[PDB]
RNA sequence: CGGAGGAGUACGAAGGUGCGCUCAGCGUGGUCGGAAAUCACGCGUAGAGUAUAAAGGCAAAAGCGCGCUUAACUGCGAGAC
RNA sequence: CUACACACGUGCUACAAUGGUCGGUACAAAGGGUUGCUACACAGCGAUGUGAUGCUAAUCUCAAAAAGCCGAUCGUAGUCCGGAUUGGAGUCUGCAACUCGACUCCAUGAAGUCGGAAUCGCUAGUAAUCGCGGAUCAGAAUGCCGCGGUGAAUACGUUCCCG
RNA sequence: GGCUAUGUAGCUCAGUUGGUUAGAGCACCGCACUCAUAAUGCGGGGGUCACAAGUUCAAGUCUCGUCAUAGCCACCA
């Protein structure tokens, strides 16, 4: 995207929302990718698989997320690693959004999977995409089991309607 | 290849490979290949991208995988909701087409349960 | 021979220094994943932590990280409790 | 009379390569048929429908024997093995197939990889395996009573088990 | 009145090492053998720790208390 949002979506959104000032025009700040894996300390093979998948879906090196606190109910202790995460900003996040809306959504079997609302009341949107497939990666042979993933889009929009306007302008189904 | 959302075997002949999709049997695969023009005994690895696209377009005209599963679930749930005799049998998880239940109903009612 | 609890250790880093960082709780949203795991944003907020009992303390944090290291030195020591 | 947390007896189909599927192509006996069996043609993927022909039968019909032989393919996999269960659409008998019929087509594709202690049948055209017919009967056989095709292995002996 | 010790399948028992529950043998239930029993052979399923509180790898595996139980000390004038 980039140039498209810079050239028309800004004035178009200002028209849409009757925004008085250029800064009050909403923008999207960051995109965060998360995998939460349990029982990672058991083998660590699945953890390496998670970091590999992240590195392919997003062209950045992920960082492993350590457990905070120690839960008796689960098998975790505060020492062990239990996840992976990446943050995408600027050009990287724009290319990630472009590739997402281009390839992933047609490939997933359920359509319009993102609901209408899925909002926190802060203009920030979250989606949970099942399986590490449905993204440009290695073919199904020579990969581990499928792993779900969390995408979170954090924007400068103040309200849910402003967030929805920004997504519809970008082409997001909802 | 990946057709209709699943990865079919590559070394098997086309007719055998296509029956790996939920919703296609031997007759349906036999008809799809005849409609497209591909020979029956051709292996999947020996098809080109255009022929794979043709097969993927032909598969679209029949219900498959998720849609067919959803429809079957809808029918059974409608029967149970209505509450007729067939829906009652479905609720009880017993034979639905009039087979005896004094003996020989293990497929429907699962493994034996001690008293 | 009144009322209640602890000790007979641990640590070459859990010591030194330079630079850097703040806890805990609750509420929304988000795959497996829930009362409670990891991710994002808010609201009140030291109620967290300090190898270990309690008390007196702790924002220049005395709490938490990273790089380099041996001052866990030798000879002393005005003056005090 | 068909119920269904369970237990037992008698059977059928399998668990595959001495096999499965497709194409071509041989060889029986016995029995039934006028409220019945139907050549042939057309329609249908099919069960079947319509028209029509012969037969009261060594005359016409059920009727395709199947395993077999030749060629291709599958290459040991829960599979091109297996065919339970379930969703959808139909045909026929019958006044009427909900409880509660048989059969056809599409889809689905369960258990099962040779079975513990124990136990059964069989001495030759026998066992094993393959098909065909009938009585009952509007319709409804894996049961019963019959018919043929292919066609084995082993018996030293009476010590023990049963009579 | 004082100390010690113990409390877990239907019964007998091990429990262990605070992650961890737990395992056994009888017994029981199905099958088999038998004219019918017993004896015998085959298969299978079973306890979540006497409780009440606290700390934490809830912990039956530590510390406190209540109850049940067993033992012997309750003396000199």
From Swiss-Prot, chain A:
One of its GO terms (cellular component) is ribosome. PROSITE patterns: RIBOSOMAL_L5. One of its GO terms (biological process) is translation. Keywords: Ribonucleoprotein, Ribosomal protein, RNA-binding, rRNA-binding, tRNA-binding. GO terms for molecular function: rRNA binding; structural constituent of ribosome; tRNA binding. Pfam families: Ribosomal_L5 (PF00281), Ribosomal_L5_C (PF00673). It comes from the Bacteria. InterPro entries: Ribosomal_uL5, Ribosomal_uL5_bac-type, Ribosomal_uL5_C, Ribosomal_uL5_CS, Ribosomal_uL5_dom_sf, Ribosomal_uL5_N. Belongs to the universal ribosomal protein uL5 family. Part of the 50S ribosomal subunit; part of the 5S rRNA/L5/L18/L25 subcomplex. Contacts the 5S rRNA and the P site tRNA. Forms a bridge to the 30S subunit in the 70S ribosome. HAMAP family: Ribosomal_uL5_B (MF_01333_B). This is one of the proteins that bind and probably mediate the attachment of the 5S RNA into the large ribosomal subunit, where it forms part of the central protuberance. In the 70S ribosome it contacts protein S13 of the 30S subunit (bridge B1b), connecting the 2 subunits; this bridge is implicated in subunit movement. Contacts the P site tRNA; the 5S rRNA and some of its associated proteins might help stabilize positioning of ribosome-bound tRNAs. This is Large ribosomal subunit protein uL5. The lineage of its organism: Bacteria, Pseudomonadati, Pseudomonadota, Gammaproteobacteria, Moraxellales.
Curated annotation (Swiss-Prot), chain B:
GO terms for cellular component: cytosol; small ribosomal subunit. GO terms for molecular function: rRNA binding; structural constituent of ribosome; tRNA binding. SUPFAM superfamilies: S13-like H2TH domain. InterPro entries: Rbsml_uS13_C, Ribosomal_uS13, Ribosomal_uS13-like_H2TH, Ribosomal_uS13_bac-type, Ribosomal_uS13_CS. It comes from the Bacteria. PROSITE patterns: RIBOSOMAL_S13_1, RIBOSOMAL_S13_2. GO terms for biological process: translation. Residues 91-115 are annotated as: Disordered. Keywords: Ribonucleoprotein, Ribosomal protein, RNA-binding, rRNA-binding, tRNA-binding. Signal peptide: none annotated. HAMAP family: Ribosomal_uS13. Belongs to the universal ribosomal protein uS13 family. Located at the top of the head of the 30S subunit, it contacts several helices of the 16S rRNA. In the 70S ribosome it contacts the 23S rRNA (bridge B1a) and protein L5 of the 50S subunit (bridge B1b), connecting the 2 subunits; these bridges are implicated in subunit movement. Contacts the tRNAs in the A and P-sites. Part of the 30S ribosomal subunit. Forms a loose heterodimer with protein S19. Forms two bridges to the 50S subunit in the 70S ribosome. This is Small ribosomal subunit protein uS13. It comes from Acinetobacter baumannii (strain AB0057).
